[PDB]
Design a protein around this ligand. Structure first.
Ligand SMILES: *C(=O)[C@@H]1CCCN1C(=O)[C@@H]1CCCN1C(=O)OCc1ccccc1
Ligand SMILES: [Ca+2]
Lengths: 6, 693
């Protein structure tokens, strides 16, 4: 559940 | 470089060997000397980063490329469907509920309304009837959580507040009366919390004061009849298994524990996949380094039987009972996933779907669900949620949601997997992503990423900033599946741990040598990146082969391998690393321990034109997992040994630290995350003298 795939 | 005080009186005797710790004072994060240290290093970093003129260009492209909607994998409770959502640049994903898979979503809890989304949702859990949602809120910067509970009908909170929770999940009983969870006292415990009560009433199920450092995970079976308590020791892939039959309690859980101890040792791993009354199917690595599936009856618990045996080659990464009487196995075959559908009863193979380069995961279907959902991602595939309706169309995977990166043509780029030889002959899988038909003429800047420990598998997932590197810096990217990972089972793990930790670094060094020789890049046009155990990887590699690299970026890494065990939760990594308290194991560590191996390479004969690559050390100031003293003491050491100890040092490449203020190791806001990555890619672009496109 990481906010974005940076 | 700012002045940094040395304390020349600190010396320890590790088994006859004197080891000085001149920067021991940086282990207190509250001394104003340390605070000033940080402030100066920050000042220096900014000074250097101001010079890196491409940061702002990277940052915009990273933002622009990340800005697309993202549905997470949906899971079902009763007749509702829950999932995470991000419109594109929301700081944290928002948890949502819906009645129909394609009906109107409703927001259930939005982390962005709280501390501006500094932290998202780590623990989240929906009751069987779909009426309650128990989730975990981080209070401050710390790892500690408070469990709260919302009614889903109206988004109102129950008064129930459970403090002193860290990584526990909340495991609902099928009566919907409460859940199990695993808190710490104000020595982990297993408890049961009844809805509408105070935490002070919660029932005790397990403690073992005699073994304070054993920790727990837990789970309930799909039929709701058994509560399993798993007991672990460190980060070793192994555990106990205790089972509690809930159907046989005179007075439900209010009686109060009498556990059937089905596995009372740390010999091997065991994960309950399904059960039929008392007849369990487990996943295990017992006499099987790749894993297998085995079956036991609790009423005759001595007799275990193979259901799906160990593969000779492929790791059985996970297993999931689905559609009443079927199994989905997820195999990792030369670092590429493979899904098999089998019969639960007989274990017999029914279908087999190999997956393209990339990663599948997040299979959260339960045994009583007939539609399975999972997420596929890859270097050039941002995110697709697939669905498979095993009832009415078992062969075909259909696309359910599909992310699209704006203004990105994935057909310009390609991804290969090749295998390269390490020092000891062992072949090492590596992925290589670059523009289509480039020249292997040695020119290209090259970023290489790895980890190498703790059984962790490095899959080649989607990163948006990677694309920027690839497209706008004419770059070549490589992910290295070195030993210490679990990619090829437990022997692959053990071949890069404890006494064989060095093989991990030789494997990485070898991948870089391949990239140089094959013609992708050249010595000093190669950047390396890694975080945590991967930061240790970066730091030991630049100590050992500084000549090979142009730039190095070590994130919240473990650098003093002599003292890591003394802080926060570093004591659970001795399984993998060793402990300096034992002479034999001290002798492993002292060889690669990054702070005790910083040497000027130009003083070695023949190696005069060499220096350390441009080095950036990234860490949070409030990092509770890998305490930031590691990063600091190294930074201090490198700056002294290589720069401030000499009148006019050949060390011209910068050595700095990017210190993130008011953040943790965990769960990072989208824009904080972008700010860091934009920084580390602009730096890298300058260190490699690489132009923008
Ligand atoms: C990063 O790699 C750091 C530094 C060395 C190992 N490590 C970890 O974060 C380890 C390795 C993967 C997970 N991990 C960890 O911190 O979890 C340990 C744990 C803490 C509390 C309860 C149960 C396990
Ligand atoms: Ca350079």
């Amino acid at each position: 559940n990481a906010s974005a795939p940076v | 470089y700012p002045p940094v005080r040395r304390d020349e009186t600190v010396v320890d005797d590790y088994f006859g060997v004197k080891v000085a710790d001149p920067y021991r004072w940086l282990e207190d994060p509250n001394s104003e000397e340390t605070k000033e240290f940080v402030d100066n290093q920050e000042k220096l970093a900014n000074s250097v980063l101001e010079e890196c003129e491409l940061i702002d260009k990277f940052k915009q492209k990273i933002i622009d490329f990340v800005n697309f909607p993202r549905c997470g994998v949906p899971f079902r409770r009763a007749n509702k469907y829950f999932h995470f959502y991000n419109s594109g640049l929301q700081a944290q994903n928002v948890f949502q509920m819906q009645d129909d898979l394609d009906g109107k979503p409703e927001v259930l809890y939005d982390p962005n309304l709280r501390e501006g989304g500094r932290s998202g949702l780590s623990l989240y859990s929906v009751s069987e009837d779909a009426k309650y949602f128990a989730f975990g809120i981080h209070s401050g910067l710390t790892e500690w959580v408070t469990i709260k509970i919302l009614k889903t009908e109206d988004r109102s909170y129950l008064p129930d507040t459970l403090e002193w929770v860290k990584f526990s999940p909340a495991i609902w009983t099928h009566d919907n009366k409460g859940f199990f969870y695993c808190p710490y006292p104000p020595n982990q415990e297993a408890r049961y919390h009844f809805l509408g009560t105070d935490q002070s009433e919660d029932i005790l199920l397990w403690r073992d004061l005699e073994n304070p450092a054993h920790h727990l995970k837990c789970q309930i079976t799909d039929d709701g009849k058994y509560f399993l308590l798993y007991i672990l020791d460190g980060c070793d892939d192994a555990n106990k298994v205790y089972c509690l039959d809930l159907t046989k309690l005179p007075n439900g859980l209010e009686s109060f524990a009498p556990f059937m101890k089905l596995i009372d040792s740390f010999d091997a791993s065991y994960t309950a996949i399904a059960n039929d009354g008392s007849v369990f199917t487990f996943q295990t690595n017992k006499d099987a380094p790749r894993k297998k599936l085995v079956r036991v009856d609790l009423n005759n618990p001595s007799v275990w039987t193979d259901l799906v045996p160990e593969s000779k080659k492929d790791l059985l990464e996970s297993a999931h009972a689905v559609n009443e009487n079927q199994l989905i196995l997820r195999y990792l075959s030369d670092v590429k996933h493979v899904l098999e559908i089998r019969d639960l009863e007989s274990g017999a193979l029914q279908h087999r779907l190999p997956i393209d380069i990339g990663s599948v995961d997040g299979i959260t279907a339960r045994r009583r669900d007939s539609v399975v959902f999972f997420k596929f991602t890859s270097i050039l595939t941002p995110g697709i949620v697939y669905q498979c309706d095993l009832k009415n169309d078992p062969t075909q995977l259909k696309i359910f949601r599909e992310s699209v990166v704006p203004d990105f043509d994935r057909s310009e780029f390609e991804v290969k997997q090749v295998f390269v030889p390490s020092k000891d002959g062992t072949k090492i899988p590596i992925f290589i992503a670059a523009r289509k038909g480039i020249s292997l003429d040695g020119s290209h800047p090259c970023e290489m990423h790895g980890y190498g420990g703790f059984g962790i598998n490095m899959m080649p997932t989607f990163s948006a900033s990677r694309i920027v590197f690839l497209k706008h810096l004419g770059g070549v990217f490589c992910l290295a599946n070195i030993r210490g990972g679990g990619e090829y089972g437990e022997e692959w793990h053990k071949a890069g741990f404890r006494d064989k930790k060095q093989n991990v670094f030789d494997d990485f060094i070898s991948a870089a040598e391949y990239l140089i020789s094959s013609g992708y890049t050249k010595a000093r046009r190669v950047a390396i990146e890694g975080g945590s155990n991967g930061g240790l990887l970066v730091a030991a590699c630049i100590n050992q082969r500084p000549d090979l690299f142009g730039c190095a970026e070590a994130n919240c890494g473990v650098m003093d391998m002599l003292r890591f065990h003394k802080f926060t939760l570093g004591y659970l990594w001795t399984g993998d690393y060793g402990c300096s308290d034992k002479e034999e194991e001290f002798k492993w560590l002292i060889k690669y321990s990054p702070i005790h191996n910083v040497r000027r390479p130009w003083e070695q004969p023949g190696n005069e034109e060499t220096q350390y690559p441009a080095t950036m050390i990234l860490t949070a100031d409030h990092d509770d997992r890998v305490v930031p003293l590691h990063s600091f003491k190294l930074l201090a050491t490198m700056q002294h040994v290589l720069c401030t100890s000499l009148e006019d040092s050949p060390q011209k490449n910068p050595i700095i630290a990017r210190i993130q203020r008011k953040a943790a190791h965990y769960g990072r806001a989208t824009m904080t995350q972008i700010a860091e990555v934009a920084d580390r890619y602009g730096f890298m672009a300058k260190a490699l003298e690489a132009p923008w496109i």
